[PDB]
Amino acid sequence: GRVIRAQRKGAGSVFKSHTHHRKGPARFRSLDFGERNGYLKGVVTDVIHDPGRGAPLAKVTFRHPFRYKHQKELFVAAEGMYTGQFVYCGRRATLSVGNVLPLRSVPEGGVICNVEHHVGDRGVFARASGDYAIVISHNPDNGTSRIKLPSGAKKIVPSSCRAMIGQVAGGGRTEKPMLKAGNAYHKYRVKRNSWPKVRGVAMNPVEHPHGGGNHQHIGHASTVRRDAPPGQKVGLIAARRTGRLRGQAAA
């Protein structure tokens, strides 16, 4: 055979990320003394649309804690933020939509976004458009907390992980039908070369395990094992089940 598209995507040749107009990494602030042990006042200046990402970005202009200059930080906008708002960072930031607090300071039941995972890695969960994590519970004997991620999973995170209270903006975006291959194309230009996506069944055997045959069919079980060598692991990987999801399994 020959190397298969699922294998060709790891090269970087044409499949790299189309990031010429992206506005930079959207993440929190470098955690420091002031924001360990108090609050810092920063002011939003603009809500800028970040290309290739559904969530708006908020330019936040802090004042540098110990040198004399501004700090243009760049957050993932929580639905509610507006220009001119004061967002406060730290542990004694009041629980206001837009402020970022450690989880030691979010009462249980509260919605948060952009959750860090190792204290100071600047936000990894609940970041895409319109997704949030609920702080289910706390454990102060180990200094940890638990959250319900967007996926429906439940992760124990350090109680000093920061989080932006609220939910990410841009929610409800994936409800609108695109209705056009044109819309799909203009969606994927600014993310990466991953569209149009050709059915394997309409390929020749030399480039896809489903390929060939006087009719179009897979010809063998489309569920492949977890360990199958790269180039064989195409189809439905390590599937626990298939068919339309009914009943409890659809939870």
């Binding site: 507006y82 629980l95 039941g109 919605v111 319109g130 903006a169 409800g172 409800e175 609108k176």
Partner: peptide
């Protein structure tokens, strides 16, 4: 007024963020 406000994808105020804002104020 030149103020630009992050909102829903197709409506300025999403009902989910309305629930969120009320929850956050109560919880504060």
């Amino acid at each position: 007024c030149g103020k630009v406000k992050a909102g829903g994808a197709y409506t300025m105020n999403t009902a989910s963020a309305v629930t969120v804002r009320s929850t956050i104020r109560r919880l504060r």
